Design an enzyme around this catalytic site. Structure first.
Site, PDB file in Angstrom:
ATOM      1  CD  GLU A   1      -2.436  -1.727   2.100  1.00 41.47           C
ATOM      2  OE1 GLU A   1      -2.258  -2.903   1.807  1.00 41.47           O
ATOM      3  OE2 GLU A   1      -2.736  -1.361   3.245  1.00 41.47           O
ATOM      4  CD  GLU A   4      -3.401  -7.579   2.298  1.00 47.25           C
ATOM      5  OE1 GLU A   4      -4.503  -7.148   2.703  1.00 47.25           O
ATOM      6  OE2 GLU A   4      -2.342  -6.924   2.369  1.00 47.25           O
TER       7      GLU A   4
END
Ligand SMILES: O=C1O[C@H](CO)[C@H](O)[C@H](O)[C@H]1O
Ligand SMILES: [Mg+2]
Ligand code: NA
Ligand code: NA
Lengths: 211, 210
Positions: free
Chosen positions: A69, A145
């Protein structure tokens, strides 16, 4: 990077490890504000290079990760290449900037669905089955994820595994995540209870989203 | 008097095992064609484009049979309706291709076309190419012609592109079949099929299997 004993235990018990640099700039606007800035390249480079220097002899580590991120900046591209040059024995992955940038050997989306597209501007999450065969795409896809296990969850988990088994280049993923990040607090009688965001007077907070 | 002995079965039949009625006979048109001694014996039309299709080159290779002569010319002209859009004229004799020279019985004409109207199943824009075999001072020997559609078909990055755009084929397989006439085709039936196909959102057909 984890406590050093973690890798020793993974070597000996046998688990494949993605070792990840301590770099996340999620709250920046846009997400790549720092990682595209050459001023932050020295600080980012140390987080990558010192991880590799420390952990490169562990057989359990099979893949390097540039972090998470932080969008996709030029600094990621530089550091991707640094690893490729210094340690050719392990693929490099990184999800930021749409999961399939020039800074990743593996298409590694977060929460891309099996059949359903989520066509966000700039960083869409394609159906994983669709993603593999986008014009010119050749890489394996492994979700960094997926199946967010928050509370009463993991609905549709079987759908992922049917697809993983049917499609050679869908080579699985990493569930989010292993363990609730709840903390212990005590009532007036000394009975322990599970606490989440906000329970320590911490504000602003994101409540139960740590579990 | 013509006599034609038609065999139902031949060694050819081994290559003709289509899932269809097995019939036989002279089931397509018969015609007589008169050509001059010095004649157009073949011609190929190609259309190539720049990156955004704003310019095309029409390339036309023409072959002759008969006696080779310096006064011989080919003119390929391109028409959009009654308007001539481009034209080229050259004597016979291709470029050198090997140690033995070139094709003295061939010529390639190249015509530039700015902003060509492009052919597709959506808008079937057509031009007319006229191929004239003639003498240096313009005495016509014969002419052949075809309809020309300016379009590029290519596969790039795993996609079939028509004029740079990825196709979506709404196709159907179509055998040549008539309930009364068998495998004889007529214009009316062919037109009826095309109309029905287009009216039902088909843009493509496969000549299954011939
Ligand atoms: O695969 C096929 O199936 C069809 C069955 O109707 C028909 O036999 C076609 O000619 C053949 O190509
Ligand atoms: Mg068959
Ligand atoms: Na698989
Ligand atoms: Na969380």
């Amino acid at each position: 990077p984890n406590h050093p004993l973690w890798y020793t235990l993974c070597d000996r018990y046998g688990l494949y490890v993605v070792d990840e640099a301590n770099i996340e700039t999620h709250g920046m606007v846009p997400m790549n504000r720092l990682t595209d800035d050459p001023r932050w390249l020295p600080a980012m480079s140390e987080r990558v290079t010192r991880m590799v220097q420390r952990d490169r002899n562990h057989p359990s580590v099979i893949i390097w990760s540039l972090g998470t991120e932080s969008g996709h900046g030029a600094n990621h591209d530089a550091l991707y290449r640094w690893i490729k040059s210094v340690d050719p024995s392990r693929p490099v992955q990184y999800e930021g900037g749409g999961a399939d940038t020039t800074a990743t050997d593996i298409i590694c989306p977060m929460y891309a669905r099996v059949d359903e597209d989520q066509p966000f501007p700039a960083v869409p999450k394609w159906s994983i089955k669709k993603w593999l065969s986008l014009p010119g795409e050749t890489r394996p896809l492994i979700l960094c994820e997926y199946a967010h296990a928050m509370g009463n969850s993991l609905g549709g988990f079987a759908k992922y595994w049917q697809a993983f088994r049917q499609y050679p280049r869908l080579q699985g993923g990493f569930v989010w995540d292993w363990v609730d990040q709840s903390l212990i607090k005590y009532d007036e009688n000394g009975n322990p209870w599970s606490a989440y965001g906000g329970d320590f007077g911490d504000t602003p907070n994101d409540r139960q989203f740590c579990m | 008097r013509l006599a034609v002995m038609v065999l139902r079965w031949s060694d050819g039949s081994y290559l003709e095992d289509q899932d269809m009625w097995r019939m036989s006979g002279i089931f397509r048109d018969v015609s007589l064609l008169h050509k001059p001694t010095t004649q157009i014996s073949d011609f190929h039309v190609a259309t190539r484009f720049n990156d955004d299709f704003s310019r095309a080159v029409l390339e036309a290779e023409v072959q002759m049979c008969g006696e080779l002569r310096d006064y011989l010319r080919v003119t390929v002209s391109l028409w959009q309706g009654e308007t001539q859009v481009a034209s080229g004229t050259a004597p016979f004799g291709g470029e050198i291709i090997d140690e033995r020279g070139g094709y003295a019985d061939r010529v390639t004409l190249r015509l530039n076309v700015e902003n060509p109207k492009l052919w597709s199943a959506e808008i079937p824009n057509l031009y007319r190419a006229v191929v004239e075999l003639h003498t240096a001072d313009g005495t016509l020997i014969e002419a052949e012609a075809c309809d020309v559609g300016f379009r590029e078909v290519r596969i790039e990055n795993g996609l079939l592109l028509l004029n740079g755009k990825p196709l979506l084929i709404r196709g159907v397989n179509r055998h040549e079949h008539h309930p009364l006439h068998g495998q004889v085709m007529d214009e009316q039936t062919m037109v009826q099929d095309i109309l029905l196909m287009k009216q039902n959102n088909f843009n493509a057909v496969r000549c299954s299997h011939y």
